[PDB]
Amino acid sequence: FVEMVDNLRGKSGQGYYVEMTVGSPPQTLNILVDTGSSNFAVGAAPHPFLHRYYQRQLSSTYRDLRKGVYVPYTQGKWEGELGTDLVSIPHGPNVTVRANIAAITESDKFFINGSNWEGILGLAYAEIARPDDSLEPFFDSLVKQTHVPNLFSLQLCGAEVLASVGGSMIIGGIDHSLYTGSLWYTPIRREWYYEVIIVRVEINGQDLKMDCKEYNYDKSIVDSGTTNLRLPKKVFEAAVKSIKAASSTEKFPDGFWLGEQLVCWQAGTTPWNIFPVISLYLMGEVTNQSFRITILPQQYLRPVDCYKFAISQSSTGTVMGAVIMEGFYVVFDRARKRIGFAVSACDEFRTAAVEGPFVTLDMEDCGY
Numbered sequence: 001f002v003e004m005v006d007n008l009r010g011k012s013g014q015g016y017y018v019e020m021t022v023g024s025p026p027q028t029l030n031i032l033v034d035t036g037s038s039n040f041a042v043g044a045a046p047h048p049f050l051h052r053y054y055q056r057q058l059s060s061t062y063r064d065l066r067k068g069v070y071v072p073y074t075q076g077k078w079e080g081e082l083g084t085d086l087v088s089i090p091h092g093p094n095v096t097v098r099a100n101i102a103a104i105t106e107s108d109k110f111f112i113n114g115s116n117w118e119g120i121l122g123l124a125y126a127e128i129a130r131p132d133d134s135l136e137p138f139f140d141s142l143v144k145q146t147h148v149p150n151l152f153s154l155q156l157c158g159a160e161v162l163a164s165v166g167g168s169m170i171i172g173g174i175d176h177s178l179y180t181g182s183l184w185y186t187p188i189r190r191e192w193y194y195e196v197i198i199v200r201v202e203i204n205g206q207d208l209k210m211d212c213k214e215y216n217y218d219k220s221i222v223d224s225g226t227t228n229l230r231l232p233k234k235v236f237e238a239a240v241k242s243i244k245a246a247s248s249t250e251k252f253p254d255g256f257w258l259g260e261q262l263v264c265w266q267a268g269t270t271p272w273n274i275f276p277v278i279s280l281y282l283m284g285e286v287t288n289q290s291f292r293i294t295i296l297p298q299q300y301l302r303p304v305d306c307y308k309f310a311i312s313q314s315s316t317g318t319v320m321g322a323v324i325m326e327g328f329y330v331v332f333d334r335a336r337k338r339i340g341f342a343v344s345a346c347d348e349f350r351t352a353a354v355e356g357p358f359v360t361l362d363m364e365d366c367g368y
């Protein structure tokens with residue numbers, strides 16, 4: 001998997017993308033790695049934010065499925081045309097797949113100005129594919145057509161323009177050099193999103209003491225296509241109160257805590273130690289057993305030395321977005337219906353951690 005290391009790039013808050021080629025001859029595009037959706041959806045017509053796009057006309061191997069797709073969603077919308085073509089990942093496995101491609105012809109608030117990607121690689125399951133679950137997701141095609149093992153892993157690394165970020169998507173395996181210590185696994189509750197179960201939450205060692213159903217209300221998911229840790233309303237309010245209290249030696253405006261206003265210190269003086277660590281305890285493979293992943297302010301204050309608060313409110317459940325994933329090497333073990341976490345290879349007092357087991361009772365009752 002040596003050749004797949006550092007195959008991801010992005011700008012802070014604009015997602016991580018992998019280089020792909022579509023069609024014959026190959027057309028090079030940058031594609032968002034998105035565990036929170038299930039379509040391979042690519043810009044296929046001019047757009048003000050797109051500097052290149054997929055040209056079906058130019059591909060000898062393109063096949064029209066003669067059906068459209070319209071996807072309205074919360075933040076925006078897109079419209080397109082379904083078909084198939086040959087798809088490769090130059091810094092991925094040495095294979096070529098015939099995949100479904102939604103060629104986006106019209107969109108609103110979908111593409112991001114300056115992001116440097118032109119499409120999305122939906123890595124989640126067929127249940128949430130558009131227009132419906134009959135449209136085989138890319139990874140499913142890849143596994144069915146090739147000898148690639150049914151697993152992928154993501155090392156998303158942190159670190160005037162938006163700061164450039166990097167990482168690795170290891171397709172078909174686990175690269176031991178990308179993590180230290182043990183890999184701890186949480187069950188995939190249901191194969192639609194990468195749905196998981198959080199059984200408790202601590203801020204600086206202090207239990208939020210909520211009924212665990214609250215942490216998963218109405219679901220909890222692992223989503224590389226979301227920047228923030230997003231939390232259900234009641235959990236969000238409990239969390240910010242706790243973080244405000246720990247960092248009380250300094251005062252910040254409401255705009256900061258609402259994740260919309262930046263906060264600055266002079267270069268090098270960021271008081272990391274006034275901000276608490278946050279531990280999410282995930283359901284273990286064994287009943288009554290959990291493990292915790294612990295994240296630092298360095299993860300949840302996102303650089304814009306100016307930072308935005310990267311924890312925000314959700315009405316669609318918990319979203320463990322890039323800022324959770326950036327602490328860790330994350331294994332999407334589809335074959336064994338489980339997601340692994342270990343401390344990623346990528347300050348002086350604190351470190352991100354993955355630690356277990358911890359005995360917490362009635363974990364199945366945390367669902368919903």
Ligand SMILES: CN1C(=O)[C@@](c2ccc(OC(F)F)cc2)(c2ccc(F)c(C#CCCCF)c2)N=C1N
Binds near residue numbers: 032036037038111112
């Ligand atoms: C939450 N989320 C989205 O809204 C979405 C998405 C993807 C496909 C969809 O339709 C499907 F049918 F093609 C609908 C929604 C998404 C859409 C547009 C975007 F610029 C981004 C992004 C980004 C970079 C910041 C976090 F990286 C994510 N991906 C996620 N995880």
